[PDB]
Design an enzyme around this catalytic site. Structure first.
Site, mmCIF file in Angstrom:
data_model
loop_
_atom_site.group_PDB
_atom_site.id
_atom_site.type_symbol
_atom_site.label_atom_id
_atom_site.label_comp_id
_atom_site.label_asym_id
_atom_site.label_seq_id
_atom_site.Cartn_x
_atom_site.Cartn_y
_atom_site.Cartn_z
ATOM 1 N N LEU B 30 7.226 5.050 13.426
ATOM 2 C CA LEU B 30 6.039 5.787 13.008
ATOM 3 C C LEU B 30 4.777 4.903 13.041
ATOM 4 O O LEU B 30 3.663 5.393 13.305
ATOM 5 C CB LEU B 30 6.246 6.385 11.610
ATOM 6 N N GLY B 33 2.312 -2.486 11.215
ATOM 7 C CA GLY B 33 1.103 -3.084 10.620
ATOM 8 C C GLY B 33 1.275 -4.590 10.608
ATOM 9 O O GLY B 33 2.148 -5.116 11.311
ATOM 10 N N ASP B 151 -5.440 -3.555 -1.250
ATOM 11 C CA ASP B 151 -5.476 -3.016 0.111
ATOM 12 C C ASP B 151 -5.806 -1.506 0.229
ATOM 13 O O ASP B 151 -5.173 -0.798 0.992
ATOM 14 C CB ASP B 151 -4.158 -3.344 0.810
ATOM 15 N N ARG B 155 -6.153 3.996 6.195
ATOM 16 C CA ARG B 155 -4.855 3.665 6.837
ATOM 17 C C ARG B 155 -3.652 3.432 5.879
ATOM 18 O O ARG B 155 -2.492 3.551 6.301
ATOM 19 C CB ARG B 155 -5.024 2.516 7.850
ATOM 20 N N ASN B 156 -3.935 3.113 4.609
ATOM 21 C CA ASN B 156 -2.919 2.865 3.577
ATOM 22 C C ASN B 156 -2.815 3.986 2.547
ATOM 23 O O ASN B 156 -2.299 3.766 1.452
ATOM 24 C CB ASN B 156 -3.132 1.522 2.852
ATOM 25 N N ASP B 169 1.387 1.227 0.622
ATOM 26 C CA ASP B 169 1.250 -0.189 0.982
ATOM 27 C C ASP B 169 0.909 -1.094 -0.210
ATOM 28 O O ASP B 169 -0.200 -1.614 -0.349
ATOM 29 C CB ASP B 169 0.330 -0.388 2.187
HETATM 30 C C1 LIG Z 1 2.940 5.400 10.012
HETATM 31 O O1 LIG Z 1 3.165 6.809 9.779
HETATM 32 C C2 LIG Z 1 3.852 7.201 8.640
HETATM 33 C C3 LIG Z 1 4.201 6.346 7.588
HETATM 34 C C4 LIG Z 1 4.888 6.839 6.476
HETATM 35 C C5 LIG Z 1 5.275 6.014 5.392
HETATM 36 N N1 LIG Z 1 4.973 4.612 5.379
HETATM 37 C C6 LIG Z 1 5.507 3.753 4.392
HETATM 38 C C7 LIG Z 1 4.669 3.039 3.551
HETATM 39 C C8 LIG Z 1 5.220 2.178 2.608
HETATM 40 C C9 LIG Z 1 6.609 2.060 2.529
HETATM 41 BR BR1 LIG Z 1 7.550 0.954 1.289
HETATM 42 C C10 LIG Z 1 7.423 2.766 3.371
HETATM 43 C C11 LIG Z 1 6.881 3.600 4.287
HETATM 44 F F1 LIG Z 1 7.761 4.233 5.067
HETATM 45 N N2 LIG Z 1 5.940 6.568 4.363
HETATM 46 C C12 LIG Z 1 6.221 7.866 4.334
HETATM 47 N N3 LIG Z 1 5.885 8.665 5.341
HETATM 48 C C13 LIG Z 1 5.230 8.182 6.425
HETATM 49 C C14 LIG Z 1 4.872 9.025 7.464
HETATM 50 C C15 LIG Z 1 4.188 8.541 8.565
HETATM 51 O O2 LIG Z 1 3.801 9.326 9.614
HETATM 52 C C16 LIG Z 1 4.359 10.623 9.702
HETATM 53 C C17 LIG Z 1 3.665 11.210 10.923
HETATM 54 C C18 LIG Z 1 3.810 12.720 10.940
HETATM 55 C C19 LIG Z 1 3.015 13.326 12.100
HETATM 56 N N4 LIG Z 1 3.322 12.706 13.414
HETATM 57 C C20 LIG Z 1 2.121 12.967 14.234
HETATM 58 C C21 LIG Z 1 3.519 11.222 13.433
HETATM 59 C C22 LIG Z 1 4.289 10.692 12.220
#
Ligand SMILES: COc1cc2c(Nc3ccc(Br)cc3F)ncnc2cc1OCC1CCN(C)CC1
Ligand SMILES: COc1cc2c(Nc3ccc(Br)cc3F)ncnc2cc1OCC1CCN(C)CC1
Lengths: 289, 289
Positions: B30, B33, B151, B155-156, B169
C-alpha cells in the site's frame, strides 16, 4: 542549532566548488536511497572541459528532514577533501538560488550490486578479487585520511568505465583524527546487516568496523550481489552475532576467501586485519589463481 | 545499547497483543515511507472476530537500520496505549519467528493527502472543516495522554469508512509526562516544512510544536493536498521562518481559517492555541457556514 549554523555558514562561503545552475541540465532518476536522490545530468563548461559533460547529481528527496539535509551538506564537505582513483570524484555543487545539487563524475555501470546482479555479464573469480582489491585500496586511503566511512556496501560502490570501483555515499562518514573512534549516542541509519558487532551494540565506529563492513561487502561480491544473512530478520542479528554466529561459506568461494571474511568479522576489533593486510591478502589470491 | 536491551526485553514478554503468523496472509504493498512498509493483509480469527478480517500490516523495509527498528518497536509500544475514535486502531503484532509485523485496522481511503489529491471527489468546505476538527479532537486526546506526536501531516492521517480521520504513524511520538517537552540532541527525521521553528532551531518538541504542524496540516487540507512552501528548498526555511515569514493565504480559504493557521505558526509557542481551542475555532466555523 548545529544545522542552522552550518546552513548559514555554508550559504555565505569556495568558487572552486560553485557551478552555475544555468549550465546544468537534469535528466532521468538513476536512484533514490534513504538520504538523497540521484539524477543523470549534463554540465556545460565544467571545470575547464569544453562543451557538455555527462555527470550525476545528488539532491534532497521531497520532504527532506534536517537529518537528510545534514547528511547532504556533510557528504559535500567530505567529497571536497578526498582524491583517489577509487573514490567517487566531486566536480561541484549548485547551492545559490535553488536546491542543493552535488555534481559528481558519472559512473557508467552504476552500483556494484546492480552490476553484480546483472552478471553470471561473464565475470571470473579474478574479476571479483580485482573488484574487492580496488575497494580495499580506496579504503586504506580513507583510513589514512582518518575517515570512517560507516556505510560500506555493494549498493554504495559505483562501477565506472573499464570496471573501476568508486567508493561512494559519504553522507555518514565521520572525522576520527582526534580519537580514532566516532561514537553516536542515538541509533544509526546504516543497515543492521552491514554493521560491526560493537557498532550494533555499543555505537562505536572505527576503521575496524569499516573492515567488518568490507567483510560483508566481500560476501556480496562473492555471491554476485546476494542478500546478507538471507531469510534472517535484522532484529535477530543482536543475538546471532553475540552468540558467535556468522554467515556460512557461500558457493563459489575458496577457503582462503572465506577465512578473510571471518577475520573481518572477528568479535574483537583488534584481531581483524587493517585494509593494507586485506589488500595483500587479495593480491596473494589473485596471483595464486 | 538501548536497542539491544529493548529487543531482548521485547523478545521475552502480552498474549493480548500476539497474533499467530500462520493466520495472517499478506498482500499488495500500500505504501513505503522513510521508516517502514505497509501491506494489505487479511487475518483469520482476529481478536474474537469470526472468519477473515481485512487489515493493514506495517513491517521493516529491506536493509533496516537500528533507527528504523527502534521506530517500529516504539510505534508498537505507543499503539498499545492509545484508544480513540480518531487514532488508528491496533490489533496486534506477529513477533515470534519471522519479521515484526504490526497489524492495524484497515482504512478504506488510505492517506488523507491521497484522499484530498484525488478530490475537487466533490468535497465542501464543511467536509474540510470536519476533517480538521476530527484530527484536532484526536490531538487533544493525545495531548491529554501526554504524547507529542511530532509527525503530524496529511500523509500520516488515514481516512476510514465514512470519511473518518485516523491519526497514524506513531514511530516518532514521545512520552512527555515528566517535563512537557521532548528534546532530541541529534537531527530529527521529520520533514523540515512541518516542523515548528523551535524544533527546527532548538530541537524542542511539545504539544505546541504539534500545533504548529497542525497549522501546516490545515494548509494541506485547505489546498486539497498542496505542497507546503511550494518551490522553496527546505534549507531556506531557517532564514524564512526566523525573519517572520509564513505561507500566504491560499485560494478557497476564509480569513478566519487563515488566522487560525497563523496562530498555529506564532513564533512564541505560548501564543499558539491548544488543541481544545482549535476544536472550538473549527466548530464555530462549521456552524457559521
Ligand atoms: C499507504 O496506504 C494505506 C495505509 C494504511 C495503514 N498504514 C499503517 C500505518 C501505521 C501502522 Br502501525 C500500520 C499501518 F498499516 N493502515 C491502515 N490502512 C491503510 C490503508 C492504506 O491505503 C488503503 C488504500 C485504499 C485505496 N486504494 C486506492 C489504495 C490503498
Ligand atoms: C543510482 O545509479 C547511479 C548513481 C551514480 C552516482 N551516485 C552518486 C553518489 C553520490 C553522490 Br554526491 C552523487 C551521485 F550522483 N554517481 C555517479 N554515477 C552514478 C551512476 C548511476 O547509475 C548509472 C546507471 C548506468 C546503467 N543504467 C542501467 C542505469 C544507470
Amino acid at each position: 542549532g548545529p544545522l542552522s549554523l552550518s546552513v548559514d555558514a555554508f550559504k555565505i562561503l569556495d568558487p572552486k566548488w560553485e557551478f552555475p545552475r544555468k549550465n546544468l541540465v537534469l535528466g532521468k532518476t538513476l536512484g533514490e536511497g534513504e538520504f538523497g536522490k540521484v539524477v543523470k545530468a549534463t554540465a556545460f563548461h565544467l571545470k575547464g572541459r569544453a562543451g557538455y559533460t555527462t555527470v550525476a547529481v545528488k539532491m534532497l528527496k521531497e520532504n527532506a528532514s534536517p537529518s537528510e539535509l545534514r547528511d547532504l551538506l556533510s557528504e559535500f564537505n567530505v567529497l571536497k577533501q578526498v582524491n583517489h582513483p577509487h573514490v567517487i570524484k566531486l566536480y561541484g555543487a549548485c547551492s545559490q538560488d535553488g536546491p542543493l545539487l552535488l555534481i559528481v563524475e558519472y559512473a557508467k555501470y552504476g552500483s556494484l550490486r546492480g552490476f553484480l546482479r546483472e552478471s553470471r555479464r561473464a565475470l571470473t573469480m579474478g574479476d571479483l578479487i580485482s573488484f574487492a582489491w580496488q575497494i580495499s585500496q580506496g579504503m586504506q586511503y580513507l583510513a589514512e585520511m582518518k575517515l570512517v566511512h560507516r556505510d560500506l556496501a555493494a549498493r554504495n560502490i559505483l562501477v565506472a568505465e573499464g570496471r573501476k570501483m568508486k567508493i561512494s555515499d559519504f553522507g555518514l562518514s565521520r572525522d576520527v583524527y582526534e580519537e580514532d573512534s566516532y561514537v553516536k549516542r542515538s541509533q544509526g541509519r546504516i543497515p543492521v546487516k552491514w554493521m560491526a558487532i560493537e557498532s550494533l551494540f555499543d555505537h562505536i565506529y572505527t576503521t575496524q568496523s569499516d573492515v567488518w563492513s568490507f567483510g560483508v561487502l566481500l560476501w556480496e561480491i562473492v555471491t554476485l550481489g546476494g542478500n546478507p544473512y538471507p531469510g534472517i530478520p535484522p532484529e535477530r542479528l543482536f543475538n546471532l552475532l553475540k552468540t558467535g554466529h556468522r554467515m556460512e561459506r557461500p558457493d563459489n568461494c575458496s577457503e582462503e576467501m572465506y577465512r578473510l571474511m571471518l577475520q573481518c568479522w572477528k568479535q574483537e576489533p583488534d584481531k581483524r586485519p587493517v585494509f593494507a593486510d586485506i589488500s595483500k591478502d587479495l593480491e596473494k589470491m589473485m596471483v595464486k589463481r
